[PDB]
Write a protein that binds this ligand. Structure first.
Ligand code: PLP
Ligand code: PLP
Ligand code: NTZ
Ligand code: NTZ
Lengths: 831, 831
């Protein structure tokens, strides 16, 4: 039998085929004689979507009947990936659709590769959101992910001459079978305008209006029949002031100018985190905050209140019925906006509105590196949003009065912890507005949460230590194990069962097969098959025959200086220099695969991508190197390429300067799928080593105390250049043009940076790194010992399930109890 | 029984209900507890669309098997109206859906009023196209209407203070159930660029590319199971040079700037015909021409050639397999564009390509008034389209050489009939390019076609008299009789049967009931019911209780000076002045209803709309007038309001200065539905009077000889002002402010125009008009005599069926034989 990838029932394969042909004809308006793979993909997509509308409808009615506390997860990013296989998996439908389509003569795996990725994310942030939504539905929570429906997702990367070329991601060219446009619930978002003070209230008057049309996507829980909702807002011009204030213009042009209000959801801002002070960005931010809060209050006004008991619109019970999670400072405006709707329109006292706002709101901090912090120009919030900058001033004023009452005379504290930064451009510190106005603040890994309490939010911690918490990131076992690695999920399933997909802690039962020759041959058999498929796919749809017998060494994640892909490059060049030095000496063979996208304006990231392809140019055509070493740049890394590379890797690179990667989630995906980690004590790498023991990790380099000590004495890269002749050789190979022969000067900016302005200390972790790399090649040479260190990683992945993360959020921040018990499946009834 | 509006079969009402509930749940993702009328409308729309995909698919496969000559009707306008009831009607589905929804507790008529109008038209032109497509499908023709899918149709008119206020028509807010986006057939349209001459061919190189994505709408023939296609193109940015030429810009902004190539199908140009030299217009024009011609050639390369016999791509057989009809000069570029594709890309000799182009192309002229003629600036075609302005020069050059060979020494002929007009701005006369390059040129009524041969295309006629023809416009009996007036279609059906809906000439058999008291009571009973519904609807969804016992006097059509709504106003004021003069004298009571939209920039049309509401202001609140007279301005006249007003009218106003309305089609809709016509000898009014006899019309005023005679001596309105004291009174009532009391000066521009610059001679037809109006009130007083003049109009409407027009086009221009025999209905098979 295939796997136990659901049952492939006799009646159930019949009904699927019938339904597939009903949509090819009626929905696609094709007949099997004119239909492409694409049309076949859409006929399956619609037949699978049919199976979850019954549940979606029953799940929502259900939340209205028993009125639970609802969780609204506000994220300007959700990186969802392809959703056909995830839907079949969470419904138990995958070998039925696989039997069914096979009987129609269709390879289901061809049809799945047809689907565009919903790449409405940049990377770790949007994917954490995607992974949390799958767990919230799996934990039975009344939760709604609330985002912007971008027309253009993250750009498609093209490597054109070794240089990244960006291309627009038109993911909707062919439509999306998964959403349901809900025009009926269009809502108004107000922008610009002014505040006039009646001696009764403040009114924000004279505003331009943009309409927000919701689009819902179903989020199915794993086999529990819960289908929750991801609501994404789309911007629409009002077809009224646009044609109500005329006063010269021209009719055609008043109609052309509407794609100017619709531009607010045109595109995802490509900043794999760094901050850009653009008005379009603040507008996208305010758009998802104002539209969503209207939906929250709407759903609160109805319920067991817009119906009965203590008859005033009781906002006192708002925090017990509502929880909104601010995923970074991107939705921070949900705090002066919930104060606006409460104080201005519901007319509550300022102090009572504030008690309700902090009891509702919670903030997650995702990074400590300062270029990623949102600090908005006040002339910008004054122009665009004038009531909110007034409310924000009021929050700041009353906050400092309580800080000053607690730390009397500490004038510096006050300057430090102000929401208003004075300076060249007066600005508002959005992080500070989120700690002031949330009842919980949290980091994404234990090292990061501590660093928040010890450096960046130290003063805020001293005031309100009770707010700071930690919720270590997680990954969902479904896509990141059952979906991308059916083979590995099957041999685990054989030994310990299938219940491990709702609690990955049962993977701990695998420790008992570390010494079991069948299991060691099985764990290594599937890793060798996965490596055979990714080797194949790569030739087939991209390039050169890579050796499946190499150690697949892969670093896939956004190109940044802190993530230190130039440190991995120094190691690759080191390897090539040792082969050339001693050509006829055996080395363990490697296929180094580095991939990720660079934000368009980050010139150094773009230069780093050119280095890696320039190293591929040299190494891969050296006859003396032969086959022992290959350098490959994985073009257009996205969620669906991650489901391909990560099951095929032997070594995971997680090499960030200690203290800079807040958590990482790529690192956890690689631990679940049988790759060992070489990594610094950074982010969740610390808790990963601790979970499997240091002896099962290749942890190395400076620790955070060591980066501070080094920074206090002063970091000087020249010193490493002197003491290490292999680092001398490399640097001079860069400067003189060995890797760029037609343009000797080409990598001069990287040399100079390393040498003179390296904020991330690449050179200080070089000897410990290249030595730690000698120990993993050493272990690789002993197959049986690699596979058992691997079995001790896999066996110890349970903490890293987003189901653990979410039962921690539910319980310690939202006040909700996670259930995982099947709701009734609709079967017939249309209500 | 309801009517014989199809059968309401037992199994068939069952299957419809089941299918209605399957789409409410699965397609709308609603349950009957949360579903509005709107959601009910869309569940019926999708169940009715299901019934025609089987036929659409079988009809297209069919045209490929037996390979007929195909007709491509190119129109920048199709004014389709609402399509639910037209689809139920052409499929025999209307009392089944009516039983079915009633049994679900739904008033089907509520649900039909939910549908937006596809208002992709301005008026007579787009609606003629809509009416032709219904007849082509009904006459079994392999025909495709080819247009632009505008995002914004014709603006919605708001009368705000008596002034027209325009509003954007967002007809797609809620989606369209009728189209099928066909992304798979996106095609490239080239713009700008340059021509370089290789000494082998000319290449148009360096062009910007815009993508054209097709959207198909099914056009169902009346009960013959033919479902043909209306393909509408949508503009899309290439997601490649837009992000392939960077060279400074900014990534976000390169993605925002795509709504700039997508602007080509953003909006319908609102010019109820007059001509505006805008680049966006030439671009929309070139867009539908280039995309469509790629589809024509594509479908020609395949067939019984891209398969077999005399093995070169035989363009010689192109005119025998292809006919494109140029509906006005808007698609005239189909002539240098078919020469481009043939000469530049297929490499045919110039002379051979020209024989194929004129044998394919035919041109329909729709008006003679000069402000409507397209004369494009050469610096514009040189910039935007440089190969086409070069090809056009080449056509002009070889045309004048044959003119000069036929009329030797006639240097003025040559200046006159040139495609290039010299002058201040050198220009290209598109009408002239269409007569040069088409094998048939035609007018839309016998008077208009003659006037073309005698004035405007006289020189072209003298050269090639064989080209000029006439095809008198028509209206489809289905929407304009069976759909809007089921009652009238039923009592005709009772007496003479139902076969009259495929040949309206059988209405001639009705002459036999002119003296039949049952039929005279029936014809007048349904007109009184229709007048009761339109009186009701008007209060209910708009305004004041109008008297159903009045003569409903209505003029609905675009506001222009030539259509002479100010002449109808002079008559209304005349009536009000006679009541006031002699208040206690019986007059026949009237409800005058004037309605139509004004192009946004035509200040006089906007002033005329303010006059009519200003006359409504006065008259409708005069207590002495009481109820004998009411003036109503029908706000936002569109196809669906036409299906409401036209069945409820007693008098049709068709009052154009003789020689200016080329045909009219409103006039024919009113003759089919039992209204008598008061009209000048203009357009098809001439053939309408002739069809029913002059004695059954209220024909009046100057004839065309009389407008020429008057123009040669010199038209002077002052002379009419002197001889007619009732016209003096009115003019001075306008000048002094009787109708505009707060602003006496307000109608000063209209007075001045009438008095000093009336190109359409309103004053010269005033006495004959107001006297002719005394004769219709006279007849109205004799109910039995009105209803029998009416029965002689209705009985004589057959010539005015677009089925006659199209069997004339098919046979005398396209070389096709009309069939009307049922194709097989699919019943089960999905191929
Ligand atoms: C998981 C994931 C990430 C996160 O990677 P890190 O290494 O944690 O920075 C980024 N992009 C994609 C495509 C992912 O799947
Ligand atoms: C038929 C029709 C017209 C044509 O009217 P004419 O009086 O011939 O100019 C214009 N608009 C609409 C809505 C129509 O139905
Ligand atoms: O918490 C989710 C991820 C973390 O895993 C990364 O370490 C951090 O750089 C980040 N920034 N935004 N989102 N993220
Ligand atoms: O032929 C269709 C209609 C005619 O009936 C009108 O008389 C004419 O003004 C016109 N202009 N464009 N289209 N049309």
């Amino acid at each position: 039998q295939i796997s136990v990838r659901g049952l492939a029932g006799v009646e159930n394969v019949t009904e699927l085929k019938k339904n597939f042909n009903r949509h090819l004809h009626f929905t696609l308006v094709k007949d099997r004689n004119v239909a492409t793979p694409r049309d076949y993909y859409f006929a399956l997509a619609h037949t699978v979507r049919d199976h979850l509308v019954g549940r979606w409808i029953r799940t929502q009615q259900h939340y209205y009947e028993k009125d639970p506390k609802r969780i609204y997860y506000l994220s300007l990013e959700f990186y969802m990936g392809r959703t056909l296989q995830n839907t079949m998996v969470n419904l138990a439908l995958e070998n039925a659709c696989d039997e069914a389509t096979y009987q129609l003569g269709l390879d289901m795996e061809e049809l799945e590769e047809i689907e565009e990725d919903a790449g409405l994310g940049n990377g770790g942030l949007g994917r954490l959101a995607a992974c949390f939504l799958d767990s919230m539905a799996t934990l039975g929570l009344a939760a709604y992910g609330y985002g912007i429906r971008y027309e253009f997702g993250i750009f498609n990367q093209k490597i054109c001459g070794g240089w990244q070329m960006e291309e627009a991601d038109d993911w909707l060219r062919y439509g999306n079978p998964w959403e349901k446009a809900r025009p009926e619930f269009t809502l108004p978002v107000h922008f610009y305008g002014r505040v006039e003070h009646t001696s009764q209230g403040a009114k924000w008057v004279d505003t331009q209006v943009v309409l927000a049309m919701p689009y819902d996507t179903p989020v199915p829980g794993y086999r529990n029949n819960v289908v929750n909702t991801m609501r994404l807002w789309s911007a629409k011009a009002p077809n009224d002031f646009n044609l109500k204030d005329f006063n010269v213009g021209g009719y055609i042009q008043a109609v052309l100018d509407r794609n100017l209000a619709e531009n607010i959801s045109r595109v995802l801002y490509p900043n794999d985190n760094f901050f850009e002070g653009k008005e379009l960005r603040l507008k996208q931010e305010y758009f998802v905050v104002a539209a969503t809060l209207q939906d929250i209050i709407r759903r609160f006004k109805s319920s067991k209140f817009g119906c009965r008991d203590p008859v005033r619109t009781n906002f006192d019970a708002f925090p017990d019925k509502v929880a909104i999670q601010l995923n970074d400072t991107h939705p921070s405006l949900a705090i002066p906006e919930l104060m606006r709707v409460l104080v201005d329109l519901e007319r509550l006292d300022w102090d009572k509105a504030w008690e309700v706002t902090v009891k509702t709101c919670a903030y997650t901090n995702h990074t400590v590196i300062p270029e990623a912090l949102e600090r908005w120009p006040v002339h910008l919030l004054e122009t665009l949003l004038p009531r909110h900058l007034q409310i924000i001033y009021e929050i700041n004023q009353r906050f400092l009065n309580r800080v000053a009452a607690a730390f009397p005379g500490d004038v510096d504290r006050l300057r430090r912890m102000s929401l208003v930064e004075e300076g060249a451009v007066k600005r508002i510190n959005m992080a500070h507005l989120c700690i002031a106005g949330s009842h919980a603040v949290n980091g994404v890994a234990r090292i990061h949460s501590e660093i928040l309490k010890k450096t960046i939010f130290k003063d805020f911690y001293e005031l309100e230590p009770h707010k700071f918490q930690n919720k270590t990131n997680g990954i969902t076992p479904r896509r990141w194990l059952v979906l991308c690695n059916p083979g590995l999920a099957e041999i685990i399933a054989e030994r310990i069962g299938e219940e491990y997909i709702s609690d990955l802690d049962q993977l701990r039962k695998l420790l008992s097969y570390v010494d079991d020759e069948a299991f060691i041959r099985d764990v290594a058999k599937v890793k060798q098959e996965n490596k055979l498929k990714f080797a194949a796919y790569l030739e087939r749809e991209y390039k050169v025959h890579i050796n499946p017998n190499s150690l697949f060494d892969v670093q896939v994640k956004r190109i940044h200086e802190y993530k230190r892909q130039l440190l991995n490059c120094l190691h690759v060049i080191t390897l090539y220099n040792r082969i050339k030095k001693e050509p006829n000496k055996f080395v363990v063979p490697r296929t180094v695969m580095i991939g990720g996208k660079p934000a368009p304006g980050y010139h150094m990231a773009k230069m780093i991508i050119k280095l890696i392809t320039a190293i591929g140019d040299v190494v891969n055509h050296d006859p003396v190197v032969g086959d022992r070493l290959r350098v490959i740049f994985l073009e257009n890394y996205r969620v669906s390429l991650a489901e391909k590379v990560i099951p095929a890797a032997d070594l995971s690179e997680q090499i960030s300067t200690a203290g800079t990667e807040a958590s990482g989630t790529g690192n956890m995906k690689f631990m679940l799928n049988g790759a060992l980690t070489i990594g610094t004590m950074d982010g969740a790498n610390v808790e990963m080593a601790e979970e499997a023991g240091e002896e099962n990790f290749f942890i190395f380099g400076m620790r955070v105390e060591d980066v501070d000590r080094l920074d206090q004495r002063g970091y000087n890269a020249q010193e490493y250049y002197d003491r290490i002749p292999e680092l001398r050789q490399i640097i001079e190979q860069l400067s003189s043009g060995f890797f760029s022969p037609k343009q000797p000067d080409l990598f001069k900016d990287i040399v100079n940076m390393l040498m003179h302005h390296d904020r991330f200390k690449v050179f200080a972790d070089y000897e410990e790194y290249v030595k730690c790399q000698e120990r993993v090649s050493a272990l690789y040479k002993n197959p049986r010992e690699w596979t058992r260190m691997v079995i001790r990683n896999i066996a110890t992945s349970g903490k890293f399930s987003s189901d653990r993360t979410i039962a921690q959020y539910a319980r310690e921040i939202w006040g909700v109890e996670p259930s995982r018990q099947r709701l009734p499946a609709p079967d017939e009834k249309i209500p």
